[PDB]
């Protein structure tokens, strides 16, 4: 469930959340409110990208996982398919003049 965003990144979620939060320890130890008006606005506009990056990357996976008869078997090759040797079913396909069964 978290793999809709690469796990190389859930740590970098923290690092910047730390690097902004540490400024309150600059204020206390180590214009008006422009100092934090720039940070919180760039931060908001930044974290507002991570959500859209996540939402689209999730939708990009979820739409793809909504794309998956004899035709379905016929028009592909990953799934092997067959019949009992020298039985009426094998003969049916061997003698079928219908395209798809002929393909199979």
């Amino acid at each position: 469930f978290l793999n809709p965003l690469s796990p190389d990144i859930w740590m970098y979620v923290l690092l910047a959340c730390l690097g902004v939060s540490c400024v309150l320890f600059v204020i206390a130890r180590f214009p008006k409110a422009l100092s934090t008006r720039i940070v919180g606005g760039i931060w908001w506009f930044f974290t507002l990208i991570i959500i859209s990056s996540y939402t689209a990357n999730l939708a990009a996976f979820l739409t793809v996982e909504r794309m998956e008869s004899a035709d379905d078997l016929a028009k592909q090759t990953k799934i092997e398919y067959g019949a009992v040797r020298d039985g009426s079913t094998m003969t049916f396909f061997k003698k079928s003049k219908i395209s798809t069964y002929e393909k199979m």
Partner: peptide, 22 residues
């Protein structure tokens, strides 16, 4: 990849605050 394109814009506003008042 395109993941990291805005980690620099993130890192842009961080140093931009340091040079505001001191």
């Amino acid at each position: 990849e395109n993941i990291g394109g805005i980690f620099i814009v993130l890192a842009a506003g961080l140093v931009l605050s340091v040079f505001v008042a001191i």
